[PDB]
Amino acid sequence: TGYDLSNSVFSPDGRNFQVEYAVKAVENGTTSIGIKCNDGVVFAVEKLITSKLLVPQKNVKIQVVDRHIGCVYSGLIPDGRHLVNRGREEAASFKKLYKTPIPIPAFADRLGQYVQAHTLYNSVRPFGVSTIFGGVDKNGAHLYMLEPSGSYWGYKGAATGKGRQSAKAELEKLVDHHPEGLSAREAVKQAAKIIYLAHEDNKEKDFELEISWCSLSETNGLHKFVKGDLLQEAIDFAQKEIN
Amino acid sequence: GSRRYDSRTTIFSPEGRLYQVEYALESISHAGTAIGIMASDGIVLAAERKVTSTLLEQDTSTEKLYKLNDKIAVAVAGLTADAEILINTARIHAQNYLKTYNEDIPVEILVRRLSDIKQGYTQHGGLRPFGVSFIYAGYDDRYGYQLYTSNPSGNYTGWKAISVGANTSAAQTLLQMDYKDDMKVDDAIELALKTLSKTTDSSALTYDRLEFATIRKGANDGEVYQKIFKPQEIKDILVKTGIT
Amino acid sequence: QFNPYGDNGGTILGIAGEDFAVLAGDTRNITDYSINSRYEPKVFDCGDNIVMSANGFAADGDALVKRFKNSVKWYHFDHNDKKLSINSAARNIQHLLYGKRFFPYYVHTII
Amino acid sequence: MTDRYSFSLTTFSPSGKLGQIDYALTAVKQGVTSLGIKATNGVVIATEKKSSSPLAMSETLSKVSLLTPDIGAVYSGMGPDYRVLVDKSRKVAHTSYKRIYGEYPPTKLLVSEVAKIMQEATQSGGVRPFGVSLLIAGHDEFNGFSLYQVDPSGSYFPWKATAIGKGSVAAKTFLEKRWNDELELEDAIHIALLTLKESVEGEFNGDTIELAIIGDENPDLLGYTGIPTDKGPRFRKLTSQEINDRLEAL
Amino acid sequence: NNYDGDTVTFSPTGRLFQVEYALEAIKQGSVTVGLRSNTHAVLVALKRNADELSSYQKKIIKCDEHMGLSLAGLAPDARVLSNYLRQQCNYSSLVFNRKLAVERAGHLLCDKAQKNTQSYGGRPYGVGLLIIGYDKSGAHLLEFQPSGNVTELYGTAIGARSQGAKTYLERTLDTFIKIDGNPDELIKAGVEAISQSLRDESLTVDNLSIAIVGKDTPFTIYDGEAVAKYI
Amino acid sequence: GYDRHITIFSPEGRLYQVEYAFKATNQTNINSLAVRGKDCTVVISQKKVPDKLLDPTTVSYIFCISRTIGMVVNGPIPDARNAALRAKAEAAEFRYKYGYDMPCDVLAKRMANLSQIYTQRAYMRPLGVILTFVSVDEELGPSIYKTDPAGYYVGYKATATGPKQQEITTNLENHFKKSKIDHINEESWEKVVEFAITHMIDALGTEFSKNDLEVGVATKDKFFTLSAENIEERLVAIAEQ
Amino acid sequence: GYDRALSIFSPDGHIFQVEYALEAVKRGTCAVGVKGKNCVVLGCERRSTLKLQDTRITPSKVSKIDSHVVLSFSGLNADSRILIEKARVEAQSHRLTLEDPVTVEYLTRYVAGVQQRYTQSGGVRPFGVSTLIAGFDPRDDEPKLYQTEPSGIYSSWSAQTIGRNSKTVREFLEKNYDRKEPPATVEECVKLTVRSLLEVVQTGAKNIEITVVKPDSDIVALSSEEINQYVTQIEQEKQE
Amino acid sequence: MDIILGIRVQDSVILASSKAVTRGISVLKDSDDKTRQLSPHTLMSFAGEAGDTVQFAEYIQANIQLYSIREDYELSPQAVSSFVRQELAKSIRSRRPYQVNVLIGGYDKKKNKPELYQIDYLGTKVELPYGAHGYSGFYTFSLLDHHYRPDMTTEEGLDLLKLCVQELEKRMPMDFKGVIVKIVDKDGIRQVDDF
Amino acid sequence: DRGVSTFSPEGRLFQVEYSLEAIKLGSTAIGIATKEGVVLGVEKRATSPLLESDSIEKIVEIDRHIGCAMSGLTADARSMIEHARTAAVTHNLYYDEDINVESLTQSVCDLALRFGELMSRPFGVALLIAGHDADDGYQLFHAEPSGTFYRYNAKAIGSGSEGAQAELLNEWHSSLTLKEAELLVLKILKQVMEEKLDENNAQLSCITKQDGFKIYDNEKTAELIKELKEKEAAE
């Protein structure tokens, strides 16, 4: 056989094993989530505190695209940065020509088509990240999750990395008991909790919480990081809910 | 990446042989035999068709013998399609020479350039070599009548009589035996046919499995004529030399 | 039609003593009959004890001094922090200017 | 990204076979039977329209294609390969002939160009050979009527009559029995239909048989009048109705 | 094993073996320590000689007046990466009259190393770098690695037996983080860290390389006689 | 056998990568079906939203290529979108170059040619998708044209694609043997949609709620997809029948 | 274009494509060059499983590069034509720019550079050829003889041989060539050149070629007759 | 530059070319050889734009010498002339055209015929019994029309040339410092050492 | 087979490491650095006595102040020497000065690693680059196909190098005169040379600040050889 040694080769299953191997490196990664809310989206990630030498607050992983789109990912971090760089060129180009900032579904496909292009040839390796992203546009809020095959969908909430199942379990609960909506501020607390919860599947090292959000009311449709009193407030909320 | 699927067509064996050249020659050894014989007053080209079906259009076909210019022709043994690529190249090359110097191209110069193109495919580019050997028959005012062969290696040599394709070891023995230097074209014609008659893998040699051509001075005073024999003209020559 | 050059005026002057040297330049910057600035320096310390002024078209003058200051910085990197001698600076600048032989820096240069 | 396969995928094996040409020919052997017969006053090419689904409309799938007003093509083997070859074949008639001489190429030379394209897929980097054999029927003023077969190797041969694909061995034998050099076009059409009845399993009628001719000039098919020396295409596709007429008298 | 012939191939468990082998060259390389206070950042590097008759390989390279790094692994790869960084510092200066933020220098190295890990016929960089600088937001230390992973730290160490110094700094953290406005004391704590990674040999005078950058201190390298003070 | 990794011939004259690309076509476990009315062309595909976290509105395999052309894909979504964007680009270029809307069959041919190239050139893999193109063409009327990873294409009276495709196919052939005609003899698209769903139910042995389907309709001068409510209305009409 | 590194190092530090190119040289017809006091002689075996050969027109194994410089070779004939062309081109270019014909060392250095370049460029195999380049620098009466080989290494030789059984004829030249006393005339040198080939050749019939090069572009190819005398004189001086 | 002539007599071609090289109001040189031997039995004289003349001649010369070596054979004058014409015909539609006019005087050994070819910088070739480039022609053509005979000896050819040069020294405005004369016959190329 | 730019599991480039083996098969090259000059000496190793040994050019001038010796696949050196000379003259053109010995060496070693899938393989030759500049006086550099260059007080490369380096490790002290260093190179060569050392099969060269890079002709070397036996016999 040997169908898995080269990207873009179809196996007899109809599968591309290199993309499936890419997924393992993603599944190996730190946990990260995203939550759709009334008028925005919230993003959050687990950052393993490798050592005490890591300057706290200073290895930021959530990356902004344009002024209105947040992107977080689990897997090979350099691969993630590469994808955002591309995304930023796409939003720059789209704005340059059409004047309006790039709508989220529009942006979703730009990343989707690019990632998918890295499953088309054997001279490239597929991306080693699943990417949670989105924001606010002229039609409202949108959250997307994109995978190494280039597959993506719109999500009510999403998670990837080591704690994806614990995270997905907690996300399904939110979805069921809040069918009329969840406020942007609420989603920031819930996000904190779910990262603390999903950190159990990954708990040799203790971790640093990092949140961001775009809300049409709270941040005016722009991407800002959660800091100071609001960060600590959600850190405390999550600390309650683990005991 | 893609390296994994690369045959490496242009490398040496441990014995210093070009695999693909060796295998092209092995391919060429199953082709219809072609024979060139050079006389003091002209050149003969005779080639055997890959076994014809009764329904093939005999006269309108050209499988073996091609015209390069008015003064030069080639007999082919190998893949026909490969041969055609090289022939159109040779024809153009003869026209560039005429355009540049206002003189017909010297036979060797054309031969050398075709052999140089073949050579290239065995040294660079990673493509398969041309599965073709030519017998060149032609004339120019420096060396007169000339016969050459080239093969997939890009090597070329001159001949008084020579064969390519199938059974060339058998054919070269029979040519070596009966060829004389004083020989006239009409005897060379007879030799060519008698030689194919013996080496053929067919039960009998008939007109409809032959391509035949001569280059003589047999027109008007020191000017050269190429003759690609029609079916009937070969059929007559077959009877006059007593092979049918 | 676009004219890519201009004249920013001013004047410069250099003199060599036995163990010292000067490079003087007025600080006036003009175009046509207007003053742009009464104090716009055009004589620069370029490191390694070299001072330089490219007088004429200001945009070109700044471009050259910038590139020479960058040349000096790279000379240090590529040649183990060696000091750039005035003669070697002189020759370097010849190549900077002649590089644009067919669309010159309109400047009179003194180091 | 981009093509990094700049080496040949067809190479000589130690026996001197070209593996990929051999295997393309095997693809042609599997293909549905097609044939051509040359009469004194025209040429017929024919094949079976073996429909994939009955829900398919097999008239939207033309196995017999006009290349020029006086030249037509048919194949056995892989359909998609044929379809692009037809596209390239039509265009090369224009770029490398009609745009130069102001007339359509003669059959042997259009064939020669097609053969060239097919030879290049046998030696160029990063491609496989074309998995089809073509029968090209055509007319031109100085050569008259002609019929050519073109193989994956790039080779071509002129034929009085022949067949390719599935039942080609049997079909050629049957064509040898019947072919003479005094056949009138209608005689060749009749023979073509008989020969094609051999290698057709199910239904045999005007909707399952594709048949075109290179025959007389058709001014009624030209589209305009007034230039007396333009007299219209010699390539005509027989209609479903027309085929069935000859099946009653079969 | 079957999936280590190139950078463009993932293992069944989702690893990139050519990147891991690239990481291995750092492990073989001579040790280098980096650490910082609020006012300065220091690089200490152990230089390795070929034999008794050879110079000791340079480990520290200046990038701008305010930035520099130390290397462990393939030296030419560090030359390429440092050169690229020198250009990005340059570009920032000539275009924006702006000294390049150490954080951006980090991101730019990461993306440059990354291209080599995703495309055919290339190879990962075979070197590890520690970047110190003093920009508009104080003193910084960065750890680069040829996977692309850049890391901001108070202190760290890479190369042969680096684990010793890396634990010591982790112990010393609260002491050295506050050596503010003292150059010599940050250097000696760096020298102490590197000593945790020595075996059957200690710091001689042409063996040891130290660099410092800080508030009113250009990035400058101390070598030979000018490090005798610190052994 | 590296003849099983790239698109070169095997000893029996086959392209295994093309064959394995056909296998990927069914990974989504979705069946699609298209029929022609007198005035319209309807294309229905099953809709399956497994995870509860998904936004069900973004889960679609029907695409709006042009104003007049719609396309349903059977195969993985990344390849599906690659084919969608490309077809959109080609339909827009055609309109600009030639001054009329690209016909369904022509777009089908062009995409088929593109697919063919991947079967011949080694560096391009085939896309693991089957593309069913629908419109009411201005010359040919209601049209269905389908493309596969072989680069094959043909027009259909009606068609189906997916795992349970053979059942849907024979179900439709049975209807047309009986009905004796080329299409659904029905005035409005609403009743052609009902027919399409009704015969999908019979053939699959399953019922559908409004969220289990996704419907595309092409009339003269536009193609559009039905909302959940449009289908509910359609399903209710079927109920009382 | 085609990129592959065909010439690469193996774990033992050998480049197998260069070494296999040397095997092709081994299999090529023999060639020897011997330089006299006042001349250089080039001799070449001609393989003899071929009659019907038209030697009027078949490529001569010794080629003039310029009118004062000749090159012969052993190995692939096709490869040799490419080197000979570039060498001829460079010869004329050196005349055009330096206003002086090439020295023999320069011409050798160039041809050697070509061979070497083909040892470390992607998509090409090395030349399956070694050469003997011989002639006289302009306005210089001292004879020159150089060897090149597929790797690109080159050097000067008092006398030297390449190709099949060159080990045998090198053996002969090594004990029959006195450095202290080169063959003092053309006559003597030709004899030692033919004698050496006769260890390996066969009959000296259509089997030995000789070219003599004297100073000031004075090159003359010998003919059957003249060669044949040296052959008969060598054999009747053998009966001891 | 300015003056280059050629006369083809019975058994030779005779080329006369002025020795002066002038820039501004200075005769820089008075012994210039405006000729290159292309092959042993073919000579080319040249005139026109400074720099282009020599560069062209030497480029042509190099190509013919290469050909000779490659094929161990001398191109016929007709073939050299066609090669040169084509090179000039290329140059005229180039970015910066060669501004050089030439005369090619050659003895064809196969035909045993002398041949004179006149080619201008546009690549306009003609075979002539006598030819000239520049203002020279305006005097010499009519002079030769009257005095030239097809069967003249080489000595008579040189005397015909003396007539041409006398006339040019009488009526031409510029001082061209005499000519250098060269004969091309069956025995190759030689130069007359006083004229 | 497998990519030319592949890392081994030990973290080394296969193709580089293999080139290093090829260099070990090369003829011996030794250089020694003193306050009076740098000496460069080599084994000529003529493969047969019919080869004219003076045509074996393994010591080579780069500029007047920089010389170079080679060991390994010596044909691979031609382009390295050509780049070096170009770089040295070019630098002088841009800066009206002599290029530094280290800078020149850095320039040469930049070539080394630019191979892959640029040239197709690394160089199979090591170079001893010896010169003098005003900044750091006399210098000897060992330039490898890894793209790494080391400075040495003394160095041996080629087949006799492990034996020669151990010999150099004892014999070098920081006040060697030029004379002593010439004799030292001659002495260590004769030890590791398969055949017996004479003026024909070994070659000496030095570079001094005063007279620049000179290759010694066989007369002068034959006297240093005669000189060498006399010191040796007399202990």
Going from N- to C-terminal start, the domains of chain E cover: 1-231
> Does residue A30 contact residue A206 with C-beta atoms inside 8 Å?
no
Phi, psi of F112 (to 5 degrees): -65, -40
Dihedral of CA F90/F95/F97/F103: which sign? Answer: positive
**Contact between F116 and D81 using a beta-carbon 8 Å cutoff:** yes
Report how this structure was experimentally obtained. X-ray
Three-class SS of residue D211?
A: strand
Rounded to 5°, the CA angle G47-G49-G53 comes to: 80
Distance CA E169, CA E148 (A): 24
C42: burial class by Cβ within 10 Å (0-12, 13-18, 19+)? buried
- G47 to chain I nearest CA, in Å? 26
Best residue in C50, C78, C79 for a mutation probing chain I (most I CBs within 10 Å)? C79
CA distance G39 to F146: 81
Cβ proximity of F135 and F143 under 8 Å:
yes
- Domain holding F91, by residue range, is 1-241
Which residue in the block uniquely carries the two structure tokens 């949609």?
F193
Instruction: Report the 3 state secondary structure along chain F.
Output: CHHHCCCCCCCCCCCHHHHHHHHHCCCCCCCEEEEECCCEEEEEEECCCCCCCECHHHCCCEEECCCCCEEEEECCHHHHHHHHHHHHHHHHHHHHHHCCCCCHHHHHHHHHHHHHHHHHECCCCCCCCEEEEEEEECCCEEEEEEECCCCCEEEECEEEECCCHHHHHHHHHHHHHHHCCCCCCCCCHHHHHHHHHHHHHHHHCCCCCCCCEEEEEEECCEEEECCHHHHHHHHHHHHCC
Judging contacts by C-beta atoms under 8 Å, the chain C residues touching residue I135 are 80, 82
One-letter identity of residue B66? Y
Task: Give the burial string for A112-122 (b: 16+ CB within 10 Å, else e).
Answer: bbbbbebbbbb
Pick from B149, B23, E118, I122: nearest CA to D8:
B23
Cα distance between residue I167 and residue I28, in whole Å:
14
CB–CB contact I116 E23 (8 Å): no
Q: Contact, E75 vs E60, CB < 8 A?
A: no
Give bridge partners of residue G146 from the DSSP assignment: G133, G156
Is F67's Cβ below 8 Å from some Cβ in A?
no
Closest residue by Cα to residue A127 from A13, A29, A15, A41: A29
How many CB pairs (< 8 A) connect B and E? 5
Residues in chain A: 243
- The CA distance from A117 to A126, in Å, is 9
**CB-based contact A135:A77 (threshold 8 Å):** no
- Cα(I181)–Cα(I31) distance, integer angstroms: 9
Nearest to D31 by CA among D89, D80, D67: D80
Of A15, A122, A158, the CB nearest to F53: A158
| Interface test mutation site (partner F, options D13, D29, D128, max chain F beta carbons within 10 A) | D128
Nearest one of F71, F214, F223, F217 to F145, comparing CA atoms: F71
Q: Which CATH architecture has domain E1-231?
A: 4-Layer Sandwich (3.60)
Q: In units of Å, what resolution does this entry have?
A: 2.8
Using a CB-CB cut-off of 8 Å, the residues of chain B touching I4 are: none
Contact call for I and F: 3+ CB–CB distances under 8 Å: no
CATH (residue range D1-250): 3.60.20.10
Chain B residue with CA closest to E3: the answer is: B1
CB pairs under 8 A between B and F: 7
| CB neighbour list of residue B62: distance below 8 Å, 6 or more residues apart | B211, B228
Query: DSSP letter at D98?
Result: I
Residue type, B233: E
Determine the Cα–Cα distance for residues F105 and A231; give it in Å rounded to an integer. 57
Which residues from E are below 8 Å from B when comparing CB atoms? 6, 8, 120-121
Nearest chain D CA: its distance from A1 CA (Å): 20
CB contacts under 8 A, B 20-39 vs E, are none
Per the structure, the complete domain to which residue B207 belongs is given by 1-244
Into how many domains does chain B fold? 1
CA pair distance I154, E54, nearest whole angstrom:
8
Contacts of residue E209, defined as CB under 8 A and 6 or more positions apart, other chains included, come to: E43, E44, E45, E46, E47, E56, E58, E59, E60, E70, E221, E222, E223, E227
Residue among E42, E16, E18, E79 at smallest CA distance from E157 = E42
Q: Chain A to chain D, count of Cβ pairs less than 8 Å apart?
A: 6
Structure tokens at F142: 């209601």
Q: How many CA atoms does the CB half-sphere of F143 hold within 13 Å?
A: 28
Integer-rounded Cα radius of gyration of chain H:
16
The CB density around residue C62, as the number of other CB atoms within 10 Å, is 14
Q: Is F119 on the interface with D (CB under 8 A)?
A: yes
Q: What are residue I145's DSSP bridge partners?
A: none
Contact C66 E94 (CB under 8 A): yes
> Distance from first CA to last CA of chain C, Å, rounded?
35
Residues paired with D37 in a beta bridge: D44, D161
CATH assignment, A1-243: 3.60.20.10
DSSP state of I167: H
Q: Which CATH number fits domain H1-195: 3.30.70.100, 3.60.20.10, 3.40.640.10, 3.30.560.10?
A: 3.60.20.10
Contact B16/E at CB under 8 A = no
Q: How far is CA B232 from the centre of its chain?
A: 22
Among B100, B103, B109, the residue with its CB nearest the CB of H71 is: B109
Query: What H or E segment, with its residue span, contains residue B188?
Result: helix B185-199
Report the number of secondary-structure helices (H) and strands (E) in chain H: 4, 12
The neighbour count for residue E35, using CB atoms within 10 Å, is 33
Judging contacts by C-beta atoms under 8 Å, the chain B residues touching residue I3 are 3
Q: How far apart are CA F159 and CA F130, in angstroms?
A: 12
Give partners of A (≥3 CB pairs < 8 A).
Answer: B, D, E, F
- Helix or strand run (H / E) with residue E103: helix E102-115
Contact across the interface for G116 and I25, Cβ inside 8 Å:
no
With beta carbons under 8 A apart, name residues in chain F contacting A168. Answer: 51, 53
Distance from CA of A114 to the nearest CA of F (A): 10
Q: Select I1-235's CATH number: 3.30.2310.20, 3.20.20.450, 3.30.70.20, 3.60.20.10.
A: 3.60.20.10
Subunits with 3+ Cβ pairs within 8 Å of F are: A, B, D
Alpha carbon distance A114, A136 (integer Å)? 22
Which residue from B234, B227, B239 is spatially nearest to B43, judged by alpha carbons?
B227
- Residue identified by tokens 């152990």 is E46
**Would you give the distance in Å from CA C28 to the centre of its chain?**
16
> Which residue in I112, I56, I117 sits closest to I83, CA to CA?
I112
- Which two three-digit tokens encode residue G57? 């027109």
Phi, psi of A66 (to 5 degrees): 60, -135
Q: Which residues of A are catalytic?
A: 30
**Which residue in chain E has the smallest CA separation from C62?**
E94
The span from the CA of A192 to the CA of A45, in Å, is: 9
Please check whether residue I74 is in contact with residue I125, taking contact to mean a CB–CB distance below 8 angstroms: yes
Burial of E177 (0-12, 13-18, 19+ CB in 10 A): middle
- The neighbouring-strand residues paired with B9 are none
Best residue in G92, G95, G220 to probe H by mutation, most H CBs within 10 Å? G92
**B83, B121, G34, I44 from G160: Cα distances, Å:** 41, 32, 7, 18
Q: Which of residues 106-135 of G touch I (CB under 8 A)?
A: 112-113, 116, 119-122
Q: What does the alpha-carbon distance between residue H165 and residue H136 come to, in Å, rounded to a whole number?
A: 9
DSSP C68: H
Buried b or exposed e, range C73-90, using 16+ CB within 10 angstroms: bebbeebeebebeeebbe
Radius of gyration of chain D from Cα atoms? 18
**I to A contact (≥3 Cβ pairs closer than 8 Å):** no
Question: How far is it, in rounded angstroms, from Cα G173 to Cα G159?
Answer: 7
Q: Determine the residue of chain A that is closest to D4 in CA distance.
A: A123
Nearest CA in chain A to F28: A14
Chain-chain contact of C78 with I95 (C-beta, under 8 angstroms): no
Pairing verdict, β E127-135 and E138-144: antiparallel
Integer angstrom CA distances of residue E172 from E153, E185, F93, G24: 14, 13, 67, 68
Q: Which alpha helices (DSSP H) does chain I contain, by range?
A: 14-24, 78-95, 101-112, 161-171, 178-192, 218-233
Report helix, strand and coil shares of chain G as percent, to nearest 5. Answer: 35, 25, 40
Question: How far is residue C41's CA from residue C44's CA, in Å, rounded to a whole number?
Answer: 8
Domain borders along chain I are: 1-235
Quote the CA–CA distance of E128 and E105 in Å, as a whole number.
15
List, in sequence order, the alpha helices (H) in chain D. 19-30, 79-93, 99-101, 107-120, 168-178, 185-198, 240-248
Q: In chain B, which residues have their Cβ closer than 8 Å to the Cβ of E8?
A: 1
Cβ-nearest to I9 among E21, E79, E122: E21
Contact call for residues H47 and H2 (beta carbons, < 8 A): yes
Contact F178, F190 (CB under 8 A): no
CA distance B148 to chain G (A): 8
Instruction: Return the residue of D nearest to F108 by Cα.
Output: D60
Q: Is E217 exposed, middle or buried (0-12, 13-18, 19+ CB in 10 A)?
A: middle
